[PDB]
């Protein structure tokens, strides 16, 4: 059985009968007629609404944490996947793999109507990237978010604030290892690691970048992937954040992201070499410094450079201290936030030092990334 | 009458005839065939294009102010509402309720084809949230925007710059009580009120938050909804803005949002207790300080804290003045913008004081919120 | 031949037979039935998916530079244009006009399946804005981007980083003359010109705005379109940037956008009057200062004002130096970045001077705009 048809040009001056259906052979679609409107009413092909992802609440993430190891996709969520229309009329549980402390997971809605998480960010086990659509993810932290203002524990669990979807997420290209602070912006859960090109900026249980362990040189700014910076200047850490679509925090962002940490308390000892791990000779465990949003080592471990200048100035003469990229005159300090392991009672969510010019490279300054919250 | 149909798998190898219409029984949609392409051309179900909202000009708001109390939705606006395609081929009047000075209104496109405003932000009177779709809103201000640089008047009217829609709006979750400054970013029409949890940050005829009338403690940072901060430090104002998805202005934003105010002039008297209302003993009326964008009390009434540091530093010694959240070293002032009622000829759209550390909490400093402009 | 049909209310209780197709006469669409679900499964009209623009990779631009004067639209790109569905299953060459050094081009997808560029931003030659849909563009630069840190050449060619599309672009309303820096944010290729209202902020071979040649007064802040500012204070440049949906760069942005320039080198001579052109008496050619991203005269030519305050303060005494818009107390310097033609070895991608208050207006300070990267 074939229906009445013709080109779009033939349809343009065609007022059919009421309830007549024809086929536009140029467009390969149906045109409905009403016996009055010339041209009729063409229907949409599926090609145009592929990649459709609709949520009932566009200003909230698509998933809900229901327990330490469990989560659900929300009701009224519709996801086009592999030509199919997969929807969830009620809250539906997400099928989890084995969960391992300090690991990021992707959530997929598959063409068979199921929803599931996986450590693989191309495709979940038993599927391909065609039959399973990556729609979001979360971080499975090594410890809880702070319930009050005394840090958290060492019980691994899903960080509820780390839940992102493809329309509710970090603006940074890579959303992994980040958490949403008070609904306003995202922060890296972990301090920047040396090997941030392969690991991303925010990873559990890696060597922390600082003035004595400089980060890998950005491949977007002359790095080859092996080379590191010679030191931990503000300039270098800032460059690394730009590489990853992030920036260093300002004071408003830092006090927000670090809230929940144990205030006026430092790690103690002689160093904090590693993210999410007790420091060298430390008197407080890493989890003492977990913020309400699951920011790990949020204060009292290492200063983070900040994206703000002020305080003590350098010399009022040109000083070539930018790694060979010009000189500075009356250069103000770049902000340092949080305090370090040796700061005793000066550390906190509002701890700030404005005595270091951006060229300084001590062992006790690293960096934490932040970025804008993106709704699509 | 029933049509030839099968599963998607049966359709995959099926190359029918030209102008053949079949039914995919898995997708419950029509598949047009051309007698050549295997699989055919599946058509889109309506579920995938619910929440459709299309504007002719995506880089501008969907509505136009046509007078003090009237507005239209723009031609070429298509709006899906409860199954129905509602479109406006010409500029169409919005049905208005009684308009009350200093009130925010929501605009709805209803399934009967009408468009109407209402002070209720769930549903207009005579409709529900299902038969009426909130697509935007505006602020009906207590006075005019400034036509030049001498403030405005006291004739209540729609603020054209306060018009927002669901794809042209403040990035902050709550778009109410904000105005678009020079197309670049949004600013709170009103200074922050004490009771901002219930009122939002920007509300007419409320008590202003300052150093001697601290804002309600953010419920995202340890507040219970009843208690206020112990004082009105920069820290607390910045936190309140973060809560609401906003920030304090920088100097570039402040001069823009305040342009149109009466420069080098202050409210006079002894206080400015209330938004959108004359100050206590004021020698200038409140409307003298309305900006071009309809920012009320934009200068010369109360300083706003700013999101920028510099100027005079605190001691080059660790100072525990952050409300118990660490110490600061060589802490630069946080900018103050605009001047207060007591600032005589120092006030204006570029008035700035950089002698106040963030720990200061005076009766003459409050806050005004800003946030990014969001196009979707 | 007419099909069974009725209103939407009649369709509500109607459960048809499997594979039945009726016509909703209110919606003028087809409803597929399955013999169980009441209401059936309505199909979408084409009206709801007009403006459809879909890319395989939504986190990258839709085009690829394939040579100095050639480019292609990417595989998997689907564009609605004038009723048609135009798709490119493989990388498809863009038809180019004559390309002229220092010119912006728009890319159009047309309703005959062709893709083409044109210097005209309303429609390409041989088409209208109805039969040709503007979906992006690029800058054809007067010389290459920097391959390393010695600037670029003077071979006119497409700047790969200046490629934008309608869903991958500067947040600023006008995306022309900008380039994407490290995937993170957009920068003006050229320093701000005097005639920025008609030219945009970023244009080749125009007079550069600075303290001795003030920019046109913004028409959003009291300008008539002919008058220039009384001087080139920070305030005026910041206002111009706000007008165009941009801002001055912070330190993190400046070091990123200028990377690739010839470091510790200045233009020399007595002046740099013009964008993309050798300075007056210059000892280094303009292209020596082209950055990796194709930012022209990125360092060593004129200082840019920055959107950050610190360093040397003005008097701790109210000073009326804001052009009649209030007074400032302890005003910190506004950052200057890059060095100017007379800065010898002090110039570079991290050159900074914090000794000029915002009220200063010398011949060697101009401005460069930046804005956020927008993905839709
Ligand atoms: Mg270390
Ligand atoms: Mg700043
Ligand atoms: Mg008060
Ligand atoms: Mg000049
Ligand atoms: Mg500063």
From Swiss-Prot, chains A, B, C:
Family annotation (InterPro entries): CTDL_fold, Mtd_2nd, Mtd_N, SUMF_sf
GO cellular component, one term: virus tail, fiber
Keyword Plastid in record: no
One Pfam short name: mtd_2nd
Keywords for this protein: Host-virus interaction, Late protein, Viral attachment to host adhesion receptor, Viral attachment to host cell, Viral receptor tropism switching, Viral tail fiber protein, Viral tail protein, Virion, Virus entry into host cell
SUPFAM superfamilies the UniProt entry points to: Bacteriophage trimeric proteins domain (SSF141658), C-type lectin-like (SSF56436)
The keyword Transmembrane is assigned to this record: no
Domain of life: Viruses
Cellular compartments annotated: Virion
Domain notes: The C-terminus contains a variable sequence in which nucleotide subtitutions can be introduced at 23 sites by the DGR.
Complex formation: Homotrimer.
Biological role stated in the UniProt entry: Tail fiber protein located at the distal ends of the fibers that binds to the adhesion receptors on the host surface, thereby determining the host range. The phage can alter its tropism by modifying this protein. Variants are expressed through a diversity-generating retroelement (DGR) that creates mutant copies of a template repeat and replaces the end of the tail fiber receptor-binding protein with these sequences, thus changing the host range. Milliards of variants of the fiber receptor-binding protein can be created with this system.
Full protein name: Tail fiber receptor-binding protein
Source species of the chain: Bordetella phage BPP-1
